[PDB]
């Protein structure tokens, strides 16, 4: 899911203001998003993984210099590592 809803409207409304507004992301929303990323791999819902990761990365990319650039690299690392062990490939968003 994302927090309590798999709705991309909810996912988006979480991720967007999170990445843009929160000066210092605490580990608890960071561990919930990484958990779902790896779980969407194993739950055969890499459709929703596509939506979540592409939106998350896009905002963390366009952020100039913040923790969000390190969070970009961390979350994207762990998801692609599970995905290459499970599905045997690493989705490059580009």
């Amino acid at each position: 899911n994302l927090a309590g809803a798999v709705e991309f409207n909810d996912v988006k409304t979480l991720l967007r203001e999170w990445i843009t507004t929160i000066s210092d992301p605490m580990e608890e929303d960071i561990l919930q998003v990484v958990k779902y990323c790896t779980d969407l791999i194993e739950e055969k819902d890499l459709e929703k993984l596509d939506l979540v990761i592409k939106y998350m990365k896009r905002l963390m990319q366009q952020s100039v210099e913040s923790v969000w650039n390190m969070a970009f690299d961390f979350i994207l690392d762990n998801v692609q590592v599970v995905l290459q062990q499970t599905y045997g490939s690493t989705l490059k968003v580009t």
Binding site: G4, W18, D29, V33
Partner: peptide
């Protein structure tokens, strides 16, 4: 108990 500095997703978590 969790949240560190007021969770943004974990506040909107599966909890009502």
């Amino acid at each position: 108990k969790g949240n560190m500095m007021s969770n943004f997703f974990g506040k909107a978590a599966m909890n009502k």
